[PDB]
Structure 1
Amino acid sequence: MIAHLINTDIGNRGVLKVYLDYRRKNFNFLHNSTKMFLDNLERVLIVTGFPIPPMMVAETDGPPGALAIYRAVEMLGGKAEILTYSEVEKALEPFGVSLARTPEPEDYSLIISVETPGRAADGRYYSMSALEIKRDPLDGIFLKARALGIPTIGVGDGGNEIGMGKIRELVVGHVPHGEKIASVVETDELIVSAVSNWGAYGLVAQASIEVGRNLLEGWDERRVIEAISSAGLIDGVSKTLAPSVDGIRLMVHEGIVELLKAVVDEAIL
Structure 2
Amino acid sequence: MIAHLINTDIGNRGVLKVYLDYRRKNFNFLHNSTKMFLDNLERVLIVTGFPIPPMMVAETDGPPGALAIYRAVEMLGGKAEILTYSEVEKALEPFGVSLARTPEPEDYSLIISVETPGRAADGRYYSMSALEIKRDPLDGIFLKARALGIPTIGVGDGGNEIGMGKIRELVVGHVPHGEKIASVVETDELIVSAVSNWGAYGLVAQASIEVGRNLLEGWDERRVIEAISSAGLIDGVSKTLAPSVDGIRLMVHEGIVELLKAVVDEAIL
User: Is TM (by shorter chain) over 0.5?
Assistant: yes
Structure 1 residue matching 2:111: 3-state secondary structure: strand
- Tell me how far 1:187 sits from its aligned partner: 0.4
- Tell me how far 1:111 sits from its aligned partner: 0.1
Structure 2 residue matching 1:46: 3-state secondary structure: strand
1:185-214 per-position Cα deviation (integer Å, ceiling 9, x unaligned): 000000000000000000000000000000
Structure 2 residue matching 1:10: 3-state secondary structure: coil
Where does residue 145 of structure 1 map in the other structure? 145
Structure 2 residue matching 1:131: 3-state secondary structure: coil
Structure 2, unpaired ranges of 5+: none
CA distance in 2, matches of 1:237, 1:19: 20
CA distance in 1, matches of 2:237, 2:45: 27
Structure 1, unpaired ranges of 5+: none
Structure 2 residue matching 1:245: 3-state secondary structure: coil
1:216-266 per-position Cα deviation (integer Å, ceiling 9, x unaligned): 000000000000000000000110000000000000000000000000000
Structure 2 residue matching 1:244: 3-state secondary structure: coil
Where does residue 128 of structure 2 map in the other structure? 128
1:149-176 per-position Cα deviation (integer Å, ceiling 9, x unaligned): 0000000001000000000000000001
CA distance in 2, matches of 1:174, 1:83: 30
Regions of 4+ moved over 2 Å: none
Structure 2 residue matching 1:121: 3-state secondary structure: coil
TM-score by length of 2: 1.00
1:49-88 per-position Cα deviation (integer Å, ceiling 9, x unaligned): 0000000000000000000000000000000000000000
1:31-65 per-position Cα deviation (integer Å, ceiling 9, x unaligned): 00000000000000000000000000000000000
Q: Identity over the aligned pairs, expressed in percent?
A: 100
Give RMSD over aligned pairs: 0.2
TM-score by length of 1: 1.00
Structure 1 residue matching 2:137: 3-state secondary structure: coil
Where does residue 28 of structure 1 map in the other structure? 28
Where does residue 232 of structure 1 map in the other structure? 232
